[PDB]
Design a protein around this ligand. Structure first.
Ligand SMILES: O=C(O)c1cccc(NC(=O)c2ccno2)c1
Ligand SMILES: O=C(O)c1cccc(NC(=O)c2ccno2)c1
Length: 294
């Protein structure tokens, strides 16, 4: 079926939970043996969220190459993403090592450091220009260059230096700061405006390594971001946009990391975002200026 009318049919029939459970039943199951080794217990935030062995990012290090991160490679859309957990106190150095080694330009953060009164990830970037960060275990230095705080998100420019070679690179940090503690946003307008800002920066383009995207576990909000991006790209590429099947794209992405889209509400929100975004793309360029007002 098409998307917008499949949508109204699930709303009127109140069957989002049944649709979402079907996806869970059909999703791939692949081994994650490296994640479960005892030496990696303090490298995982959640015991039930692990990268598959076949798609995990390897650190370039002979002692322990493990990080809880997965490469999602979308063949038809020609987009790749790295989805990862929020860094832990003992993995912030690994996190920036991965950014360096994979040649990423951008980092997409969809959570706050504290939510629901608990810590959801480490404070892994510097908050003041004059107070840079040194990661001694991986030999990297990180400096805040500038910061632009808007109503729904903040963009930061960061300098990452490999202290071994004295090479430096500019990393863009895109921080969506207004996802509610419970549930999903009532309108997708600010999330889509945020997605378009990431796109406009070059961070999703083939001349760079894959964007690094995270929330707390790296499967829920993070899955919503890459699912919406990929579906909209396919609608622009194909002769028949109504042939894009959001459930099939989600199952394809779940071949690469478990658990993407954590609730039936996140699934419905993903539909809403793709539907509204397809109107602004066209050919409705004026659509854009509208997301930024509402
Ligand atoms: O669906 C699953 O099998 C599954 C299994 C284990 C853990 C979770 N997710 C979480 O605990 C979470 C994600 C974001 N914040 O917490 C899901
Ligand atoms: O050799 C290349 O084509 C190549 C490949 C990956 C990454 C980069 N560099 C950057 O993304 C960058 C911009 C600012 N700091 O790092 C260059």
């Amino acid at each position: 079926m098409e998307m917008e009318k499949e949508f109204e049919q699930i709303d009127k029939s109140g069957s989002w939970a049944a649709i979402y459970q079907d996806i869970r039943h059909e999703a791939s199951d692949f081994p994650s043996r490296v994640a479960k080794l005892p030496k990696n217990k303090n490298r995982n935030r959640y015991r039930d969220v692990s990268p598959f062995d076949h798609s995990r990012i390897k650190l370039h290090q002979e002692d322990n190459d493990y990080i809880n991160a997965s490469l999602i490679k979308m063949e038809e859309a020609q987009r790749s993403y790295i989805l990862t957990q929020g860094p832990l106190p003992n993995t912030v150095g690994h996190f920036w090592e991965m950014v360096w080694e994979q040649k990423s330009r951008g980092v997409v953060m969809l959570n706050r450091v504290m939510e629901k009164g608990s810590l959801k990830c480490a404070q892994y970037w510097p908050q003041k220009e004059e107070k840079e960060m040194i990661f001694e275990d991986t030999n990297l230095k990180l400096t805040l260059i500038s910061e632009d705080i808007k109503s729904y998100y903040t963009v930061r420019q960061l300098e990452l230096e490999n202290l071994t070679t004295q090479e430096t690179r500019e990393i863009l940090h895109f921080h969506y700061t207004t996802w509610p503690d419970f549930g999903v946003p009532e309108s997708p307008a600010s999330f889509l405006n945020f997605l378009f800002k990431v796109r406009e920066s070059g961070s999703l383009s083939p001349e760079h390594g894959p964007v690094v995207v995270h929330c707390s576990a790296g499967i829920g909000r993070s899955g919503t971001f890459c699912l919406a991006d990929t579906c909209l790209l396919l609608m622009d590429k194909r002769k028949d946009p109504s042939s894009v099947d959001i459930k099939k794209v989600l199952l394809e992405m779940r071949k690469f990391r478990m658990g993407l889209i954590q609730t039936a509400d996140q699934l419905r929100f993903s539909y809403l975002a793709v539907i509204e975004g397809a109107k602004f793309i066209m050919g409705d360029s004026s659509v854009q200026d509208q997301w930024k007002e509402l």
